[PDB]
Ligand binder design. Structure first.
Ligand code: PLM
Length: 133
């Protein structure tokens, strides 16, 4: 059941994004611009295929996937990773693997807001998105 995640979402709060990017080895200039960027995330479904767009003034990404089926992904910071997205406890869990490393991108709905928690190493970033009508 993925349906409550679907729609267009705008960033309205961010904690520790610099820590997370730094852990991934993102350079200072990219971190600088990213810390000021407020992306729009669009999640749409067509049958079993989900498409997740992230749009901003800095970088844009798009992925399509089926839940529970691995896919190749090239992230906004240019990592080539092996990914899988699944539902766990009602949360949308996106796991990326590369070079023996892992990061998780966990999305949960709390009071109608979409909370994205990104973990790599010890770094934990929490970003809050609100739904656009
Ligand atoms: C597509 C906009 C990405 C802006 C950040 C660019 C540099 C760091 C990328 C780290 C991995 C992706 C982070 C996604 C954060 C989010 O969706 O709010």
């Amino acid at each position: 059941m993925v349906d409550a995640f679907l729609g267009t979402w705008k960033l309205v709060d961010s904690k520790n994004v610099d820590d997370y990017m730094k852990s991934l080895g993102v350079g200072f200039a990219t971190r600088q611009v990213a810390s000021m960027t407020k992306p729009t995330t669009i999640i749409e479904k067509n049958g079993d295929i989900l498409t997740l767009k992230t749009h901003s003034t800095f970088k844009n990404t798009e992925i399509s996937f089926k839940l529970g089926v691995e896919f190749d992904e090239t992230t906004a910071d240019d990592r080539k990773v092996k990914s899988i997205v699944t539902l766990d406890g009602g949360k949308l869990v996106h796991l990326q693997k590369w070079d023996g490393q892992e990061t998780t991108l966990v999305r949960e709905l709390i009071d109608g807001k979409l909370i994205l928690t990104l973990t790599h190493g010890t770094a934990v970033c929490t970003r809050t998105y609100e739904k656009e009508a």
